[PDB]
Amino acid sequence: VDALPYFDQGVREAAAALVEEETRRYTDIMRNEFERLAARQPIELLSMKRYELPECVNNSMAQLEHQAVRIENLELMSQHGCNAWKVYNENLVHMIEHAQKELQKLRKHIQDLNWQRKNMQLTAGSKLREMESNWVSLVSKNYEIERTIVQLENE
Amino acid sequence: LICSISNEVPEHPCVSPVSNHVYERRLIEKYIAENGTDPINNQPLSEEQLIDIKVAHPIRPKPPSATSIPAILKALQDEWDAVMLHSFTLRQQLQTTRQELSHALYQHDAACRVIARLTKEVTAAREALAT
Amino acid sequence: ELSHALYQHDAACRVIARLTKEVTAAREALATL
Amino acid sequence: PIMLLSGHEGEVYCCKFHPNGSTLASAGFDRLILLWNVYGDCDNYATLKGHSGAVMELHYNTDGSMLFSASTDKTVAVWDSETGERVKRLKGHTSFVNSCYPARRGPQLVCTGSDDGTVKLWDIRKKAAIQTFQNTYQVLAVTFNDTSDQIISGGIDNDIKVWDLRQNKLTYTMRGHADSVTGLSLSSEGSYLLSNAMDNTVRVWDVRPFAPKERCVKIFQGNVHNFEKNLLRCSWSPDGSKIAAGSADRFVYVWDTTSRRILYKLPGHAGSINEVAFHPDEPIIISASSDKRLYMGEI
Amino acid sequence: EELKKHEDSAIPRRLECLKEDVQRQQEREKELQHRYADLLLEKETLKS
């Protein structure tokens, strides 16, 4: 469980194969049905192919009323014109800025976390190397004490 | 700015008092009708507890080539295709994520076993060097 | 969970990577003595 | 804070702590021994009297119950920290007794280094001498070995000498210092012993049942001497982590056992620092200097 | 965030392991010099 990421700077394929062998050891309404049938089926539902072609008298008068409604809907667009587009474009940029602000916040918090872990690991690996050196010297000391005790037994 | 169920831009945003997050009135009411609790926190919430918000009346520019034909034929069809294939891709990714989670948990248990073996190896090697 | 698990997996992989060479040094230590 | 203490009329040569870490003892030319409380405002309660010569070295027992103090007037003195009053005037020294050391955790026994040419062993109860190893010359510092069975001494001939209390011969003589050794202090390891010598070098040695036969371990640079040839004394930290030294350069030198780096050359003093005292509990430093006052540094 | 909680939980555990391995050898040093003390004491007895 314990693993010094910051201290261990220095085989992964070997341990990977060893882990590989050790693991080798061991809600919607009908809308959902129609959507899944249309997806598995894939064939998109039939749309309105009546209005454009123009039985034909009604469709024709429909094209008339619809072309009049369309020619009216293009008047209220040109009346204001390019002001309404940039009026929402300013809003687009204003909504854009907050996102990068929060991105900066997140980078900063993660960086502070990694900085804390860095110092923690730096204390810990140092204690570890000091303990290892003391262990080596203690092994050598037991060895020398053994040689001296044997010689003392010789007398 | 957004709704916290539908991922939309709400036209009548309403915020809850137990978990302060802006939801669309329609989805929030449907959620309250399904089960009477907050979606996010799963805390007790009713329709009467919700408090509607007032906003900038936010506008969408209908395309210049907007008619009954293009709205009826092409637009709704594009919307239904973008719904179906996106839901299908999300389901596929969910299945794949479950499979990857399974492979990750197995690999983790294998690493645990290997580490448990090396803990018994290394310490006794150290004792034998001490011997 | 996938991200945390992959991270902890490589982290604990380094644990065995270090422990193996530790045993490896200890083996030659005791063998030479 | 810096906490400089004053109230001494002439140089203070020796300052050391209660082995409790409760009370402070300092002494020097003024022929009397001042005491203080280490905490609070570092305040002065008591003053011990009597010593006609200069108090050249004060030394505690290892509990803190009686006080040993080597005087210039041919005498050592043991007193009651309980009272401050004399129990014994170790007379008989034929010259300037500069150094004193009470045996720690053994039978009550004292080794005193003097300017007569002898090291003297004394029992407190008998009013008589135990042993005396007349090598040839003045011995300037003396400390026991934690078995209370060897005795180490440093003088003018630069070869640190150690006698066995039972065979009474020069047990261990060590060499390598270029000029006179001025201070010995064995760490609380019972093993590592620290030696100041005015040749500008400090050394570390280790008295063991078995040592490499040439036990000159660690070496640090920095100490100074000059026309003063004042007596320079060293100490280990309670932990054997930092060595503290003084010198005639007005700089408190704090080094480490580990990396032998210069952790500190601290200014602040006006005259030569003669003795640095480590708190047995805290990171508290007390400097006794020839500027007729003391410092209480916190690190 | 879970990486630090798994790191800081076992950071003392990686320290707590070598703490004994030093102290287990550290106590072995005392007994080492204890016999080494007895080893020099009798050498003079046989030298005498």
Please, which chains are in contact with A (at least 3 CB pairs closer than 8 A)? Answer: B, C, D, E
3-state secondary structure D250-285: CCEEEEECCCCCEEEEECCCCCCEEEEEECCCCCEE
**Tokens describing residue B4:** 């916290």
- Return d(Cα B117, Cα E20) in angstroms, integer: 20
Those residues with Cβ within 8 angstroms of residue A147's Cβ, 6 or more apart along the chain or in another chain: none
- Return d(Cα D292, Cα B54) in angstroms, integer: 80
CB of B111 less than 8 A from some CB of A:
yes
User: Shortest CA distance to A46 belongs to which of D31, B74, B47, D87?
Assistant: B74
Is-contact D221 D246, C-beta < 8 A?
no
Please, which chains are in contact with B (at least 3 CB pairs closer than 8 A)? Answer: A, C, E
Alpha-carbon separation of residue D218 from A8, A114, B76, D258, E16 (angstroms): 31, 38, 87, 9, 30
Is-contact D31 D50, C-beta < 8 A?
no
User: Shortest CA distance to B1 belongs to which of B31, B23, B29?
Assistant: B23
Is-contact C25 A19, C-beta < 8 A?
no
Mark yes or no for CB contact A8/C18 under 8 Å.
yes
CB of A96 less than 8 A from some CB of C:
no
Those residues with Cβ within 8 angstroms of residue A52's Cβ, 6 or more apart along the chain or in another chain: A63, B69, B73
Q: The dihedral of CA D89, D94, D97, D102: what is its sign?
A: negative
φ, ψ dihedrals at D279, nearest 5°: -75, 130
- β-pairing, D293-298 with D4-6? antiparallel
- Return d(Cα C6, Cα D299) in angstroms, integer: 45
φ, ψ dihedrals at D115, nearest 5°: -100, 25
**Cβ neighbours of B10 (radius 10 Å):** 22
Alpha-carbon separation of residue A77 from A66, A67, A71, A73, D14 (angstroms): 17, 15, 10, 7, 98
DSSP string computed for D45-108: EEEE---SS-EEEEEE-SSSSEEEEEESSS-EEEEETTT--EEEEE---SS-EEEEEEPSSSSS
Each domain of chain B, given as residue ranges in start order, spans 1-131
The partner residue sitting opposite C12, judged by closest CB among A3, A14, A139, is A3
Those residues with Cβ within 8 angstroms of residue A34's Cβ, 6 or more apart along the chain or in another chain: none
**Tokens describing residue A74:** 């293009």
**Cβ neighbours of E48 (radius 10 Å):** 6
Residues in chain A: 155
Is-contact D34 D70, C-beta < 8 A?
no
- Return d(Cα D111, Cα D121) in angstroms, integer: 5
- State the nearest Cα–Cα gap between E39 and chain B, in angstroms: 20
- β-pairing, D12-17 with D128-133? unpaired
Alpha-carbon separation of residue D151 from D97, D154, D171, D207 (angstroms): 16, 10, 9, 10
User: Shortest CA distance to D3 belongs to which of D55, D41, D36?
Assistant: D41
Is-contact D161 D177, C-beta < 8 A?
no
3-state SS, residue A111: helix
CB of C22 less than 8 A from some CB of A:
no
Is-contact B49 B18, C-beta < 8 A?
yes
User: Shortest CA distance to D218 belongs to which of D200, D205, D199?
Assistant: D205
The helix or strand, by DSSP H or E, that contains position D183, with its residue range, turns out to be strand D181-186
- State the nearest Cα–Cα gap between B127 and chain C, in angstroms: 9
- Return d(Cα E26, Cα E22) in angstroms, integer: 6
DSSP string computed for D124-170: TTTTEEEEEE--SS-EEEEEE-TTSSEEEEEESSS-EEEEETTT-SE
Question: In B102-114, which positions are buried (b, 16+ CB within 10 angstroms) versus exposed (e)?
Answer: eebebbbebbebb
Is-contact D16 D58, C-beta < 8 A?
yes
CB of B129 less than 8 A from some CB of C:
yes
**Tokens describing residue D17:** 């702590």
Cα radius of gyration rounded to whole Å, chain D = 18
3-state SS, residue E29: helix
CB of E28 less than 8 A from some CB of B:
yes
User: Shortest CA distance to B88 belongs to which of A36, D153, D205, D63?
Assistant: A36
User: Shortest CA distance to E6 belongs to which of C5, B100, B110?
Assistant: C5
Is-contact D262 D222, C-beta < 8 A?
yes
Alpha-carbon separation of residue B15 from A64, B7, B36, B45, D243 (angstroms): 45, 15, 15, 11, 68
CB of B118 less than 8 A from some CB of A:
no
**Cβ neighbours of A15 (radius 10 Å):** 22
Is-contact D206 D217, C-beta < 8 A?
yes
The helix or strand, by DSSP H or E, that contains position B115, with its residue range, turns out to be helix B76-130
Alpha-carbon separation of residue B74 from B64, B65, B69, D282 (angstroms): 15, 12, 8, 83
User: Shortest CA distance to D259 belongs to which of D212, D219, D206?
Assistant: D219
Mark yes or no for CB contact E21/B126 under 8 Å.
yes
Is-contact D104 D64, C-beta < 8 A?
no
Do C and A touch (≥3 CB pairs < 8 Å)? yes
Give strand pairing partners of E27.
none
- Return d(Cα B70, Cα A52) in angstroms, integer: 9
**Cβ neighbours of D180 (radius 10 Å):** 19
| Count of CA atoms in the C-beta half-sphere (13 A) of D3 | 17
Q: The dihedral of CA E20, E23, E29, E32: what is its sign?
A: negative
Give strand pairing partners of D144.
D151
| Count of CA atoms in the C-beta half-sphere (13 A) of D232 | 32
- Return d(Cα D200, Cα D245) in angstroms, integer: 11
Each domain of chain A, given as residue ranges in start order, spans 1-149
Measured N-to-C along each axis, helices C2-32 and B76-130 cross at an angle, to the nearest 10 degrees, of: 20
- Return d(Cα D102, Cα D93) in angstroms, integer: 16
- Return d(Cα D54, Cα D70) in angstroms, integer: 9
Is-contact D156 D196, C-beta < 8 A?
no
- Return d(Cα C3, Cα B127) in angstroms, integer: 38
- DSSP structural state of residue B44: B
Is-contact D247 D222, C-beta < 8 A?
yes
Furthest-apart CA pair in chain E: how many Å?
71
Each domain of chain D, given as residue ranges in start order, spans 1-299
The helix or strand, by DSSP H or E, that contains position B14, with its residue range, turns out to be strand B13-15
3-state SS, residue B68: helix
Furthest-apart CA pair in chain C: how many Å?
48
> What letter represents residue D277's amino acid?
A
φ, ψ dihedrals at D109, nearest 5°: -155, 150
Mark yes or no for CB contact C13/A16 under 8 Å.
yes
The helix or strand, by DSSP H or E, that contains position D185, with its residue range, turns out to be strand D181-186
- State the nearest Cα–Cα gap between C32 and chain E, in angstroms: 20
Q: The dihedral of CA B67, B73, B78, B83: what is its sign?
A: positive
3-state SS, residue E40: helix
CB of E2 less than 8 A from some CB of C:
yes
The helix or strand, by DSSP H or E, that contains position B102, with its residue range, turns out to be helix B76-130
CB of B76 less than 8 A from some CB of A:
yes
- Return d(Cα D254, Cα D263) in angstroms, integer: 6
> Where do runs of H (alpha helix) occur along chain A?
12-25, 31-40, 56-73, 75-80, 82-154
- Return d(Cα D266, Cα B14) in angstroms, integer: 68
Is-contact D5 D287, C-beta < 8 A?
no
The torsion of the CA quartet B63, B67, B69, B74, rounded to 10 degrees, works out to 10
User: Shortest CA distance to D72 belongs to which of D135, D11, D5?
Assistant: D11
Is-contact D242 D284, C-beta < 8 A?
no
- Return d(Cα B56, Cα A90) in angstroms, integer: 14
**Tokens describing residue B118:** 């090396």
User: Shortest CA distance to D143 belongs to which of D87, D199, D205, D63?
Assistant: D205
Alpha-carbon separation of residue A41 from A34, A48, E33 (angstroms): 10, 21, 86
**Cβ neighbours of D264 (radius 10 Å):** 17
Mark yes or no for CB contact E28/B130 under 8 Å.
yes
- Return d(Cα D34, Cα D28) in angstroms, integer: 9
DSSP string computed for B74-90: IIHHHHHHHHHHHHHHH
Q: Is D25 left (phi over 0), alpha (psi -120 to 50) or beta?
A: beta
The helix or strand, by DSSP H or E, that contains position C23, with its residue range, turns out to be helix C2-32
Alpha-carbon separation of residue D283 from D188, D237, D261, D277 (angstroms): 16, 9, 18, 11
* Chain centre to alpha carbon of residue A137: 48
The torsion of the CA quartet A47, A51, A57, A63, rounded to 10 degrees, works out to 160
- Return d(Cα C2, Cα B98) in angstroms, integer: 9
* Chain centre to alpha carbon of residue B29: 19
Classify burial at D248, counting beta carbons within 10 Å of its beta carbon; exposed 0-12, middle 13-18, buried 19 or more: buried
Minimum CA–CA partner of B119 in chain E: E17
**Tokens describing residue D4:** 């400089």
- β-pairing, D219-221 with D201-206? antiparallel
User: Shortest CA distance to D286 belongs to which of D62, D12, D17?
Assistant: D17
In angstroms, how far is the first alpha carbon of chain B from the final one?
71
> What letter represents residue D29's amino acid?
F
- DSSP structural state of residue D215: -
**Cβ neighbours of A145 (radius 10 Å):** 21
CB of D212 less than 8 A from some CB of E:
no
- Return d(Cα D203, Cα D196) in angstroms, integer: 7
CATH code for the structural domain at D1-299: 2.130.10.10
Mark yes or no for CB contact B110/A139 under 8 Å.
no
